Amino acid sequence: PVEEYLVHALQGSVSSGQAHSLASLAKTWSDNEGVLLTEKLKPVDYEYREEVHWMTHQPRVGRGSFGEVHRMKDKQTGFQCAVKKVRLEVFRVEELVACAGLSSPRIVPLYGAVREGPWVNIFMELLEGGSLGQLIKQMGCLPEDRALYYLGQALEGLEYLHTRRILHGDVKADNVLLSSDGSRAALCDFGHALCLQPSLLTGDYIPGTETHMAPEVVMGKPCDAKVDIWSSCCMMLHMLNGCHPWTQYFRGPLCLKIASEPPPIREIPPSCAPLTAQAIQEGLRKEPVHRASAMELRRKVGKALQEVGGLKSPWKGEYKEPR
Numbered sequence: 289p290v291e292e293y294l295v296h297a298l299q300g301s302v303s304s305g306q307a308h309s310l311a312s313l314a315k316t317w318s319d320n321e322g323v324l325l326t327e328k329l330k331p332v333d334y335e336y337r338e339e340v341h342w343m344t345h346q347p348r349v350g351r352g353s354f355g356e357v358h359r360m361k362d363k364q365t366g367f368q369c370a371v372k373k374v375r376l377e378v379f380r381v382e383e384l385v386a387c388a389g390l391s392s393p394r395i396v397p398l399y400g401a402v403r404e405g406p407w408v409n410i411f412m413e414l415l416e417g418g419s420l421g422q423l424i425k426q427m428g429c430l431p432e433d434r435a436l437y438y439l440g441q442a443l444e445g446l447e448y449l450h451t452r453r454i455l456h457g458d459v460k461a462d463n464v465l466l467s468s469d470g471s472r473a474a475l476c477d478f479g480h481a482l483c484l485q486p487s488l489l490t491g492d493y494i495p496g497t498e499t500h501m502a503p504e505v506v507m508g509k510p511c512d513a514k515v516d517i518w519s520s521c522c523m524m525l526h527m528l529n530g531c532h533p534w535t536q537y538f539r540g541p542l543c544l545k546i547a548s549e550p551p552p553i554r555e556i557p558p559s560c561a562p563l564t565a566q567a568i569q570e571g572l573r574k575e576p577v578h579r580a581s582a583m584e585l586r587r588k589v590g591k592a593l594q595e596v597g598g599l600k601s602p603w604k605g606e607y608k609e610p611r
């Protein structure tokens with residue numbers, strides 16, 4: 289009843305505020321307005337404008353698949369964080385409604401969001417270790433113990449999202465980000481995220497990474513929290529091998545082979561310990577009913593880590609040649 293008025297008070301300004309107000313406002317995003325959740329990112333006379341109140345680090349350098357993520361600084365407070373640019377015309381409301389209010393050390397904190405013209409500018413904590421994706425390229429591929437350690441932390445973030453009926457939608461090394469010493473990993477990018485029930489190919493849908501798609505996505509069957517778990521194990525194989533599943537063996541339209549072919553358990557390295565191999569296999573079952581949940585696999589993975597003597601390799605050790 290007052291809902292309508294609260295939304296209007298938020299439009300046309302940028303304000304210091306809370307996550308519930310950011311979400312409210314973001315629902316209207318299908319000139320300069322938004323909500324900032326930390327006093328470190330501070331508006332100035334109802335505004336927060338790129339190149340006036342905040343400055344991207346120079347020269348411009350772009351991380352992410354679309355080069356859409358930048359280091360920035362609030363001109364008044366000196367606070368540094370990261371900004372992800374999303375184009376307004378393709379903005380998915382779930383990207384801010386999902387993460388808004390979330391609080392978990394396995395999920396990268398959201399610091400605010402400001403619309404300015406054809407951009408939505410999403411702010412978040414800046415994690416200097418970079419993406420797991422860029423660790424893989426830099427190191428070639430990762431030791432079994434480190435890969436387990438990171439899969440498990442991804443899976444912990446997923447327990448937290450899945451418990452609250454949120455699907456991440458594009459779990460992969462590029463969307464896990466690492467603290468500066470490498471010991472903490474955290475899920476980033478709610479651009480493909482989704483609010484769940486206990487179909488998928490309809491509406492505002494942006495599909496995830498093809499190589500990490502589960503079969504129920506691909507064949508258009510009913511989908512659920514289990515689709516993240518498949519992805520997480522494709523990511524595992526990527527950490528271990530230095531390449532995504534499927535890319536080595538099939539060349540044409542990949543999504544056809546994910547449907548018809550057996551799951552890609554042949555890509556498990558043979559020098560992997562028994563329980564590592566088995567954990568990955570249960571996360572890669574083709575029917576969601578037989579696939580492990582986040583909680584089941586996280587548990588399995590944590591004992592898999594224990595079974596190889598725990599985490600012992602240095603974070604940026606020596607280069608392992610890929611497959």
Ligand SMILES: NC(=O)c1cccn1Cc1ccccc1Cl
Nearest residue numbers: 357358359370413414415416418
């Ligand atoms: N939340 C982040 O920090 C983030 C999200 C996607 C990539 N990153 C890392 C990153 C982004 C911009 C500038 C420097 C770095 Cl190390």
